[PDB]
Design a protein around this ligand. Structure first.
Ligand SMILES: Nc1ncnc2c1ncn2[C@@H]1O[C@H](COP(=O)(O)OP(=O)(O)O)[C@@H](O)[C@H]1O
Ligand code: BEF
Ligand SMILES: [Mg+2]
Lengths: 816, 65, 56, 396
């Protein structure tokens, strides 16, 4: 039962659900205003629980679409209608242009939210969180709900301002001048008496984490959503409504929801005891590698070391010790650090905003992420390479953005995609499918091949003249570059040849705004990074599309087939034409280090002597295979931490689920003591017989406290576990309440203690979990290869972990 | 002429099966190692499976008895 | 000299063992019990089959 | 108890396994089984087959990619890629051994069908009992293959084979044809046991390793760390010869012997036990050295000393680069020497006790080395599934 037999069987399935629901919208155009409001109340109490109220989805969705028609157009296509359908099911309708991802989403988002639980709506970035947030905000105040979006450090979500605005649409609800002249998806521009009043619904006020989530819909970015989830850790107070239950979610541009391989870790408190050292130390460090040349072999992954001149340098500076390894790698660490710093990551990708002097990282498909680092050595390394040096190096928690998160609870339905690349994925983890649908007018846009050029980005030069020829013909163009550097030079190029343009390459945020509508306004020229050229309700002004419609020049082909296409797809919304073209150099990057060994012979032996335009013998063909190839590597590494972290999902669970129960409950007294003793007592009877010197000695190390309790008191043979247990138990319980003398406030003491102490231990031993990741880098040879050694060590450390807790957490409940 | 016609058919059964593995490798690889849960509850191609085992117990009664 | 060397360095290299592999031996036997046990199940059930679809 | 139930997969594949094999052997059309080493091995060419062609194309399959990828590394696009290249390579493996099993099909069917004892194989030739056998052979390969995969979902792709060994090694100890010479001197069973212990030894090879950690994904994004731990655990990586050693080499020697028994008009001359010691040592150089060489993949230091790694074993390690492969090369061939001592001593085991009273019934050495092999591997199935949850068990 697996073929088109499935894709098509899906067709009729929905072609049916749609026919019925289509009739629903038909007999409802009765200008249902106040009555519709009543319908918002009707459905409201029609579910109140995830009982999967199917029938509702029919009359409700009907109300949805129409609800839009009243507030703002854009709602007559089907892959959006059918979208929400399959969406509510958990797969992926769509593929872009017209369709309705903005509106579509709103459809199922409505039914599900009704539960009163709060639904998730993943989106790649902040700017976009705000996007959908308002683009559909209307229908929400219409269906009386509370939007809810979270971002970087602050969060907001709302409808029109104060009281007048409400008193503006309240009656205009009863009024609502619009239902007339319909019968056609030709949503033109008019009815200003409606827009000028309702369209101004887009407004936002400041709120906080709590009301945010518990509100209705929750608009946010995975980066954030993840961090929120984890924010739920060192929460001495559970009153912190930090995220109200995690479960359902629809992914806006899920073609990325997956590519978020690198885990989601909130890292922050870094108590550097060697901060001043790092300062001076790292200064010397960085300069050290400066002392050495190119030869240091740095490629195919961010790991590096150098041969001859390397060992040479090692000895050449602070360390006449040849044999450096002897538990003396701490220093070599310093070298590798700077080494990798000054090279692995161009300081120009870990930029310094306008004299903010802060070395921030805008890397990893993002767009400027304030104060933070992906590691405990890079931040301080490059810092040593620039100027102002920090003193942080912290960890805390981690998690897989998807399976560990989403599969932790409920479902998902992505938007766009199609390639087989995603189905196997949407299986091995998420557990969804695909519903490829071409809305009115399919792939109406034009595309052009991967025109290649040799020896250096000198092709990017040829693409310049290209942007020109377009400009003259009055064509609105745009380019999708790779990084910030190349992006800049790009502009400089247009300037050196005199060409107006705007650059939204994470320069400034405000830029992203203006450019929103200022990107493609007849002949307009715009250059931006893929981080702004991935899914966007872009449009176009006047005649604009007069010829071609839109033009897109790609600076190269990303690390993924989809992404490549994405940057391109940014030319086609609502269902209009356009033009795309890719300029690639056999000395670009994608193949400068990936597949270079292949392209080498296949080229220098095939042909070398020529001009510039070429792609007749295996060029676009070969590179293609390389692309998928690279993606493959990602797929591979995707495995390593995915599988591992899975075993971590278990451990982590017990972790703060325990920190939860301790935060909630009260007198775990008899428990903590008991388990503390049984653990410490069996200790006095596990690796040390309860004889005399045997125990007194080993147990001494087991009982190293400034306190005094039968320490130097020997001569005892009455140790049948019962006797020994009561002895220390009373020293505790008694001296406990006796020490409880402090006051009722003593209750919140274990609070600070338990959590912090527990949190502390865990996160610490998590540092060790990374070293264990090295042991799994060992399994490769000898024993099997299915995460074995890791699982067996993950628990070894897990048991060690806990017992450790009880010890420290214990003595801490005293010295005060 | 059941054994002759169904014979050519027995070979057909071999096709749908040799392929079930070829394509059935989104978590299988010879001596690979993937106890990959979160996926797997009686393949939609298990109809082929039942068609197979049933096919040979079928050649049992038809061949001799 | 030659082969001597190989043996001289092998004499001390003899490591990576398991003093409780005897525990593993006890299991090896258990495992064997499984094989035999399995095979014995055959004879019994296969013989019920021997009567039916065998000497019919 | 000792079983300590929980294993929701154990008895599952176990019982399921017994089922598929019953119908599998008594299958219609072939089911062949329901100069002394030749008439004891059995077959048309050189393959012991409890069934037409299922366990044969099995060993065949494994062999196909074995020597292929062996002497010939990368000739056609695929090597190792963790997932992508591994599947493309696996698919090629599929079609590969498939057509191979076909070749052997037509052959074995021919010879068999017209010259073996306890025939009862009719002569109503219509579809050729060769195309008919080709059926139960190719199709037969499928039922066993298909079964294998599933077996490899709860047990092991070799769990099907151990079922065969289980059966074979259980037919002879229940007195099926072993009481005509000897008997009541069952020390031979206990001695075989001593061999079992030897086997276990092989496993822990020289298992030892280095340091450092790192993980690179996406496009142009990764990280790094310092030092300040406080735990147990360390680095492990060396090894020793894998599975099917003595068996692969021993079968080879049986080849020049069989042909030497039936060349032109049977040039009957000696080559049975006498030249043993010589052919036995062959098992040493052949198996151990050749495999262990490729086996301990010459390129290990490349990856190790690449992600930044200076080993620590048998003393605080040091020198990086290929020089590391040098130090390791030593431990490599040395532990291999020792390995030979034991495995080779297995075939030699019966040879060292059969010096006073020799039994022309060696049936038990090779087959055992196989049956135990899968036993040990299944022990790995339990090694992982074991240890439920050690947290809170006797703590908070
Ligand atoms: N039903 C519709 N009616 C009018 N315009 C629509 C409609 N659906 C899609 N649009 C047009 O297409 C653009 C893109 O739609 P959207 O739902 O954001 O999908 P994508 O993410 O593929 O652009 C919208 O900004 C709008 O201009
Ligand atoms: F909202 Be769309 F997917 F750009
Ligand atoms: Mg959208």
């Amino acid at each position: 039962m697996i073929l088109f037999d499935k894709n098509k069987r899906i067709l009729k399935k929905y072609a049916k659900m749609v026919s019925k629901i289509n009739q629903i919208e038909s007999d409802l155009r009765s200008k249902k205003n106040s009555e519709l409001i009543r319908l918002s109340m009707v459905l409201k109490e029609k579910v109140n629980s995830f009982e999967d109220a199917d029938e509702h989805l029919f009359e409700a969705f009907a109300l949805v679409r129409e609800a839009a028609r009243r507030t703002l157009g854009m709602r007559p296509f089907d892959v959006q209608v059918m979208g929400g359908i399959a969406l509510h099911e958990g797969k992926v309708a769509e593929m872009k242009t017209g369709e309705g991802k903005t509106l579509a989403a709103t459809m199922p988002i409505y039914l599900n939210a009704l539960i009163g639980k709060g639904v998730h709506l993943v989106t790649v970035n902040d700017y976009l969180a705000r996007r959908d947030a308002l683009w559909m905000g209307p229908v929400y105040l219409f269906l009386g709900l509370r939007v809810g979006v979270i971002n970087s450090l602050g969060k907001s979500y709302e409808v029109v301002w104060k009281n007048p605005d409400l008193a503006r649409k309240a009656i205009e609800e009863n009024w609502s001048v619009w239902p007339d002249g319909f019968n056609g998806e030709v949503l033109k521009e008019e009815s200003m008496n409606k827009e000028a009043v309702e369209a101004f619904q887009v407004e936002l006020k400041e709120i906080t984490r709590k009301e945010a989530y518990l509100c209705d819909v929750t608009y946010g970015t995975n980066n954030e959503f993840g961090f929120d989830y984890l924010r739920d850790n060192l929460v001495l107070d559970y009153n912190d409504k930090v995220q109200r239950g995690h479960f359902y979610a629809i992914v806006d541009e899920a073609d990325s929801v997956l590519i978020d391989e690198a885990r989601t870790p909130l890292i922050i408190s870094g108590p550097s005891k060697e901060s001043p050292s790092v300062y001076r130390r790292f200064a010397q460090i960085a300069k050290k590698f400066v002392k050495d040349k190119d030869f240091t072999v740095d490629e195919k992954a961010r790991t590096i070391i150098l041969t001859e001149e390397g060992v040479a340098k090692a000895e050449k500076i602070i360390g006449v010790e040849n044999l450096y390894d002897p538990g003396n790698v701490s220093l070599l660490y310093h070298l590798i650090n700077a080494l990798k710093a000054l090279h692995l990551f161009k300081k120009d990708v870990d930029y310094v905003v306008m004299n903010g002097e802060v070395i921030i990282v805008d890397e990893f498909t993002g767009r400027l992420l304030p104060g933070r680092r992906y590691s405990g050595g890079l931040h301080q390394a490059i810092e040593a390479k620039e100027g102002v040096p920090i003193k942080e190096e912290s960890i805390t928690y981690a998690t897989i953005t998807f399976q560990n998160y989403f599969r932790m609870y409920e479902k998902l339905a992505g938007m766009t995609g199609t390639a087989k690349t995603e189905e196997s994925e949407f299986v091995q983890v998420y557990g969804m499918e695909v519903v490829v649908i071409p809305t009115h007018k399919p792939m109406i846009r034009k595309d052009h091949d991967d025109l290649v050029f040799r020896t250096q980005k000198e092709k990017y030069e040829k693409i310049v003249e290209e942007i020109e020829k377009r400009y003259k013909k009055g064509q609105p163009v745009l380019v999708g570059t790779t990084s910030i550097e190349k992006s800049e030079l790009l502009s400089s190029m247009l300037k050196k040849k005199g060409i107006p343009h705007q650059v939204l390459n994470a320069k400034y945020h405000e830029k992203e705004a203006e450019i929103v509508a200022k990107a493609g306004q007849k002949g307009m020229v715009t250059i931006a990074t893929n981080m702004a050229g991935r899914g966007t309700d872009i449009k176009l002004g006047p005649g604009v599309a007069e010829l071609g419609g839109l033009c897109i020049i790609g600076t190269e082909r990303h690390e993924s087939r989809r992404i490549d296409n994405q940057l391109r797809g940014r030319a086609g919304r609502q269902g209009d034409p356009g033009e795309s073209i890719f300029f690639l150099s056999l000395e670009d990057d994608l193949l400068r280090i990936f597949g270079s060994e292949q392209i080498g012979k296949v080229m220098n032996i095939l042909k070398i002597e020529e001009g510039q335009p070429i792609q007749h013998p295996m060029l676009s063909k070969l590179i293609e295979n390389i692309q998928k190839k690279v993606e493959g590597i990602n797929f591979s590494i995707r495995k390593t931490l995915m599988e591992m972290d899975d075993v971590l999902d278990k451990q982590r669970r017990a972790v703060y689920s325990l920190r939860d129960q301790i935060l909630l409950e009260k007198d775990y007294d008899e428990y903590l003591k008991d388990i503390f003793e049984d653990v410490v007592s069996t200790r006095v009877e596990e690796f040390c017989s309860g004889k005399n010197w045997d125990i007194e000695s080993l147990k001494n190390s087991l009982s190293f406290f400034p306190a005094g309790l039968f320490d130097l008191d020997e001569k005892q043979f009455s140790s049948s576990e019962e006797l020994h247990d009561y002895l220390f138990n009373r020293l505790w319980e008694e001296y406990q309440r006796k020490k409880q003398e402090i006051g009722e406030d003593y209750r919140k003491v274990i609070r600070f203690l338990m959590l912090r102490i527990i949190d502390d231990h865990w996160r610490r031993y998590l540092e060790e979990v990374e070293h264990v990741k090295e042991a799994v880098q060992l399994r490769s040879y000898g024993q099997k290869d299915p995460i074995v050694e890791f699982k067996k060590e993950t628990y070894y450390m897990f048991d060690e972990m806990m017992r450790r807790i009880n010890d420290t957490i214990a003595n801490y409940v005293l010295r005060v | 002429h059941t054994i002759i016609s169904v014979a050519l058919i027995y070979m057909v059964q071999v096709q749908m099966s040799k392929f079930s593995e070829l394509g059935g490798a989104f978590g299988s690889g010879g001596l690979h190692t993937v106890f990959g849960r979160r996926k797997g509850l009686d393949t939609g191609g298990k109809i082929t499976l039942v068609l197979s085992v049933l096919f040979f117990v079928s050649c049992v009664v038809t061949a001799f008895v | 000299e030659v082969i001597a060397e190989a043996k001289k360095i092998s004499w001390p290299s003899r490591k990576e063992l398991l003093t409780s592999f005897g525990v593993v031996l006890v299991i090896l036997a258990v495992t064997s019990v499984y094989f035999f046990v399995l095979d014995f199940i055959f004879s019994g059930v296969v013989s019920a089959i021997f009567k039916a679809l065998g000497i019919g | 108890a000792f079983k300590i139930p929980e294993l929701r997969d154990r008895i599952i594949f176990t019982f399921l396994a017994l089922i598929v094999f019953r119908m599998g052997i008594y299958i219609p059309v072939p089911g062949l089984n329901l100069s002394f080493y030749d008439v004891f091995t059995g077959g048309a060419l050189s393959r012991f087959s409890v069934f037409t062609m299922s366990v044969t194309p099995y060993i065949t399959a494994s062999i196909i990619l074995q020597l292929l990828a062996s002497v010939m590394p990368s000739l056609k696009e695929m090597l190792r890629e963790g997932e992508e290249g591994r599947k493309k390579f696996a698919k090629y493996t599929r079609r590969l051994t498939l057509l191979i099993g076909g070749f052997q099909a037509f052959f074995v069917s021919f010879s068999l069908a017209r010259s073996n004892p306890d025939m009862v194989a009719p002569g109503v030739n219509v579809l050729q009992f060769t195309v008919l056998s080709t059926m139960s052979m190719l199709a037969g390969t499928m039922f066993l293959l298909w079964l294998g995969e599933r077996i490899t979902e709860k047990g092991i792709g070799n769990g099907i084979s151990i079922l065969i060994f289980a059966g074979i090694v259980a037919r002879y100890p229940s007195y099926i044809r072993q009481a005509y010479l000897g008997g009541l001197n069952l020390l031979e069973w206990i001695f075989l046991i001593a061999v079992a212990l030897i086997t276990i030894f092989g496993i822990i090879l020289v298992q030892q390793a280095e340091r450092r950690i790192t993980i690179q994904y996406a496009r142009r994004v990764t990280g790094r760390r310092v030092y300040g731990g406080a735990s147990t655990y360390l680095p492990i990586k060396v090894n020793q010869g894998g599975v099917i050693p003595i068996i692969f080499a021993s079968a080879i020697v049986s080849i020049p012997s069989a042909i030497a028994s039936i060349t032109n008009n049977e040039t009957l001359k000696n080559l049975f036990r006498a030249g043993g010691f010589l052919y036995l040592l062959i098992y040493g150089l052949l198996v151990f050295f050749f495999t262990y060489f490729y086996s301990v993949v010459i390129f290990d230091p490349r990856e190790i000393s690449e992600n930044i790694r200076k080993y620590g074993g048998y003393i605080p390690g040091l020198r990086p680069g290929r020089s590391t492969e040098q130090y390791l090369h030593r431990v490599l061939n040395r532990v291999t020497f020792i390995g030979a001592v034991f495995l080779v001593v297995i075939a030699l085991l019966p040879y060292l006790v059969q010096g006073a009273i020799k039994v022309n019934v060696w049936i038990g050495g090779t087959s055992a080395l196989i049956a135990v092999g899968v036993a040990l591997d299944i022990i790995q199935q339990m090694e992982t599934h074991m240890v439920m949850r050690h947290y809170e068990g006797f703590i908070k």
